[PDB]
Design a protein around this ligand. Structure first.
Ligand SMILES: *[C@@H]1O[C@H](CO[C@@H]2O[C@@H](C)[C@@H](O)[C@@H](O)[C@@H]2O)[C@@H](O[C@@H]2O[C@H](CO)[C@@H](O[C@@H]3O[C@H](CO[C@H]4O[C@H](CO)[C@@H](O)[C@H](O)[C@@H]4O)[C@@H](O)[C@H](O)[C@@H]3O)[C@H](O)[C@H]2NC(C)=O)[C@H](O[C@@H]2O[C@@H](C)[C@@H](O)[C@@H](O)[C@@H]2O)[C@H]1NC(C)=O
Ligand SMILES: *[C@@H]1O[C@H](CO)[C@@H](O)[C@H](O)[C@H]1NC(C)=O
Ligand SMILES: [Ca+2]
Length: 412
């Protein structure tokens, strides 16, 4: 149908997947959920209102799945942690299944806004995590960071910690935009540091403290300390480096880019086989940086990119063909192997572009012949196109070093 990766004439152009809420309809894995072991009373103030949380009944259950489901206008389904007068180390983990480039992470809390939480991302499918924003009324003591550290050109990946969520304008909704206040934001397409900043395969929210212990048996106030949230939204695009308009499931089940521009890899981050004439690049407004096919004059199955050759060509071509067949030779299989010669009547792409020199081994000095006329390298006294007969005045000797000696009594 419509390929947004080529313009109406067919020229390659930059293309990106559509911007989505990439959290939506994906599992969130909570470290703790109320009503898991036994019913649990929890209470929220508005007058105080208590409910029972029991995971065995749908009307009483608050699983993490509620975080990325469809919400009704006055009916927000909320996940709820287990009431404890000592709540901490409670985490939510979301797998995107694929690298995305993220614009924002939004959290819509239900009861109270948590005092201290940390946002992390992974870019290796959960193997490792780095922070990217903190929230706390005591950044220094809790998270070992100064509050509201200024972002300069020399710390654009700063993971800021702030207490400004507390009476913030979003109320119970907290949104972190990845590019806000980043100096290189307007130069994103030429900012590897920012391109790294916004790349993630997973997100993780870690809650450390509900309140600074500033907010009747203890079973009663226990029913007020709990984490609770109804909407986890992660806005971004599937990362394809400008070389795909959509991501798909291939026939092996992998979620991956629908790579265009003769690229390959799950992120279109390398060139396809036999497309190694130019270095890979990310597409930009100026140019798609489409990978370029090697030229092996129909004589080679594989090729490789040689960077120094590319730099010597004037940054034009850099593919080196591998194992040229059919007695061809050269980095483009554009020449003839030693002992062969360019059959001019056929094209270089023909399976018989290079015909044997046919040089008679005894009368010639080398197997290789004149690449233009085919004439072989004749020893003294030898003549012929392939140096296979003695010249006038010479006669076949016995030695194979000098097979033609002068004829005695023959005038020269
Ligand atoms: C918020 O939304 C939920 C989910 O309902 C869906 O979403 C809303 C937005 C709307 O689009 C609905 O049409 C959707 O279905 C509401 O919960 C649902 O409420 C209705 C009416 O009370 C209830 O229907 C009865 O179901 C009985 C059987 O119940 C059991 O079986 C179901 C199927 O296995 C389970 O899903 C259910 O949990 C029970 O275990 C049946 O005998 C009756 O004849 C009705 O048909 C739905 O089952 C119920 N879905 C649930 C609980 O998952 C919320 O409604 C609120 O909660 C329930 C418990 C009542 O107290 C409601 O009166 C109350 O309003 C809704 N909250 C709002 C609107 O404030
Ligand atoms: C929090 O829980 C994890 C998972 O068991 C554990 O590895 C970690 O040590 C706990 N505490 C802290 C302070 O990280
Ligand atoms: Ca919800």
């Amino acid at each position: 149908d419509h390929d947004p990766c080529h313009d109406h004439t067919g020229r390659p152009v930059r293309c990106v997947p559509e911007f989505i809420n990439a959290a939506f309809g994906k599992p969130v894995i909570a470290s703790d959920t109320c009503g898991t072991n036994r019913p649990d009373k929890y209470c929220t103030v508005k007058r105080e209102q208590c409910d029972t949380c029991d995971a065995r009944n749908h009307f009483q259950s608050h699983p993490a799945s509620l975080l990325t489901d469809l919400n009704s206008i006055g009916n927000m389904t909320c996940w709820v942690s287990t009431p404890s007068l000592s709540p901490q180390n409670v985490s939510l983990t979301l797998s995107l299944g694929k690298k995305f480039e993220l614009t924002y992470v939004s959290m819509h809390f239900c009861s109270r806004l948590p005092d201290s939480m940390a946002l992390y991302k992974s870019a290796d499918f959960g193997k490792t995590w780095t922070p990217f924003q903190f929230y706390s009324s005591e950044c220094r003591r809790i998270f070992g960071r100064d509050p509201d550290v200024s972002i300069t050109k020399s710390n654009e990946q700063e993971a800021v910690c702030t207490a400004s969520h507390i009476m913030g304008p979003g109320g119970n909704r907290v949104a972190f935009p990845f590019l806000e206040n980043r100096p290189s934001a307007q130069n994103f397409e030429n900012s590897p540091v920012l391109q790294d900043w916004v790349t993630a395969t997973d997100i993780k929210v870690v809650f450390s403290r509900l309140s600074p212990d500033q907010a009747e048996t203890d079973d009663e106030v226990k029913q007020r300390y709990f984490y609770s949230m109804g909407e986890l939204a992660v806005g971004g695009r599937c990362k394809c480096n400008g070389h795909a308009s959509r991501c798909i499931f291939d026939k092996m089940g992998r979620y991956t880019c629908d790579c265009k521009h003769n690229t390959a890899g799950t992120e279109c981050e390398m060139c396809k086989p036999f497309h190694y004439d130019r270095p890979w690049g990310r597409a930009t407004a100026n140019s798609a940086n489409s990978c370029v096919a090697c030229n092996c004059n129909q004589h080679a199955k594989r090729c490789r990119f040689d960077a120094e050759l590319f730099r010597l060509s004037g940054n034009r071509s850099g593919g080196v063909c591998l194992n040229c067949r059919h007695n061809t030779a050269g980095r483009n299989c554009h020449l003839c192997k030693p002992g062969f010669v360019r059959d001019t009547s056929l094209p270089m792409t023909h399976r018989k572009a290079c015909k044997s020199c046919g040089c008679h081994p005894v009368g010639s000095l080398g197997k290789s012949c004149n690449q233009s006329s085919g004439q072989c390298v004749c020893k003294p006294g030898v003549t012929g196109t392939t140096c296979n007969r003695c010249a006038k005045g010479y006669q076949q000797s016995r030695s194979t070093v000098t097979p033609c000696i002068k004829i005695p009594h023959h005038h020269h």
